[PDB]
Amino acid sequence: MHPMLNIAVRAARKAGNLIAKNYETPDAVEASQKGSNDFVTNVDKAAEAVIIDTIRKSYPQHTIITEESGELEGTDQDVQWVIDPLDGTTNFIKRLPHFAVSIAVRIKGRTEVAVVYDPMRNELFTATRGQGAQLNGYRLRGSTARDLDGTILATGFPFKAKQYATTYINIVGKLFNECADFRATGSAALDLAYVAAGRVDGFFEIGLRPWDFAAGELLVREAGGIVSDFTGGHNYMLTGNIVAGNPRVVKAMLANMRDELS
């Protein structure tokens, strides 16, 4: 737990330090046809290896699930480490300095530990279940906003889910008409961390993969916010359709979502 937290942080900083070091290089950037070149993937794979190696030196019995390898079953099925070694891939390739390592520990299907770590800003966000969220050791509470007016909402376009373009764009339209403004940062795990830290008032994105929200979602819930489905449910793990923020902000956002798809 806090020994697990201590290993999650160790792993996230060593992966983070390695990703920071290569950000300062260009070496071998080779693809354009869509975006993701050999270099980010080599950098990313090396981060993943470091995280796996670090976790297995103390907990070789656990299941580890990574964005790049899927599930590496352990003898002890009751603990899963759910990891994105580099949430913000396109950012990294463009050298936009906004990306993070996300590492969640789930025990018998409940997230108990969460680390999101920005290695450019050297900001480590952490949480353990029932004990709240911190940024570099200092307690987080969400934002204190009560409606959508003068709020800032982190979000991203459904680049990987284009068939939802119209619905999404329609949702963005409605929220804008309630005097919300938007940030689009390219790192969902960081967005969730920023919800936890009140740096934004809410977050909504479609089609997230579980490794990008598993740590972020606990950050929010431990800093007094909530996370839900676009339709209000606790179904978001299956969908990846995530609305996060305090209970007022989410209720207000969910209000603007009924009359759309999902």
Side-chain angles (χ1 to χ4, degrees):
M1 167 205 259
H2 300 25
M4 291 198 285
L5 182 55
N6 149 60
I7 306 304
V9 167
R10 183 177 309 168
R13 302 204 187 261
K14 308 194 170 312
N17 305 163
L18 175 159
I19 299 152
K21 189 186 293 202
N22 280 277
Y23 168 104
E24 263 96 29
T25 310
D27 214 298
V29 159
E30 201 39 12
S32 281
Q33 224 163 240
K34 283 193 183 170
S36 186
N37 37 246
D38 275 1
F39 178 70
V40 67
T41 287
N42 294 323
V43 166
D44 175 271
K45 269 167 183 188
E48 180 203 23
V50 141
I51 285 165
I52 289 167
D53 197 61
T54 307
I55 295 174
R56 295 211 72 243
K57 291 183 189 152
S58 304
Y59 300 105
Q61 331 97 57
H62 293 161
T63 289
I64 297 161
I65 297 151
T66 80
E67 181 275 336
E68 36 310 76
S69 298
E71 175 181 35
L72 313 180
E73 274 188 286
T75 70
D76 178 354
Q77 318 260 243
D78 283 345
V79 188
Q80 305 167 331
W81 292 71
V82 179
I83 300 136
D84 196 348
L86 180 31
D87 186 11
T89 306
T90 292
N91 288 358
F92 183 95
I93 293 161
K94 308 285 187 168
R95 294 306 186 281
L96 284 153
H98 192 71
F99 42 73
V101 186
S102 185
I103 295 178
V105 194
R106 291 181 96 207
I107 299 156
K108 289 155 175 281
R110 193 172 60 184
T111 308
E112 309 279 337
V113 174
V115 173
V116 177
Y117 173 56
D118 174 347
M120 295 319 289
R121 299 200 185 266
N122 191 61
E123 291 182 332
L124 182 73
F125 303 78
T126 61
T128 67
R129 201 187 150 271
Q131 288 135 304
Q134 330 196 166
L135 163 49
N136 294 342
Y138 296 136
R139 205 78 169 287
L140 309 176
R141 274 76 200 211
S143 109
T144 52
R146 314 199 87 241
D147 73 292
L148 295 188
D149 184 44
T151 61
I152 290 297
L153 299 175
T155 179
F157 280 67
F159 195 67
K160 294 184 218 160
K162 289 185 189 169
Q163 71 267 24
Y164 293 109
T166 287
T167 289
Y168 177 74
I169 280 160
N170 289 23
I171 291 163
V172 165
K174 299 189 151 199
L175 287 173
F176 195 63
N177 309 178
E178 322 300 320
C179 309
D181 196 17
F182 307 98
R183 299 300 179 265
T185 78
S187 183
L190 275 178
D191 302 334
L192 289 168
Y194 281 19
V195 173
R199 290 178 184 187
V200 302
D201 302 282
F203 170 75
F204 64 99
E205 189 170 353
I206 286 167
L208 289 194
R209 291 87 160 82
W211 34 77
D212 293 326
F213 62 83
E217 177 254 347
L218 184 75
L219 295 186
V220 169
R221 293 193 280 89
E222 283 301 299
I226 61 159
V227 346
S228 96
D229 210 341
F230 276 40
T231 52
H234 193 109
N235 231 83
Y236 49 84
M237 168 67 77
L238 274 208
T239 62
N241 290 342
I242 294 250
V243 171
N246 74 43
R248 273 163 175 95
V249 168
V250 165
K251 185 195 182 152
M253 277 185 282
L254 287 178
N256 288 101
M257 305 185 196
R258 322 198 192 302
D259 308 29
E260 314 300 332
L261 252 176
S262 54

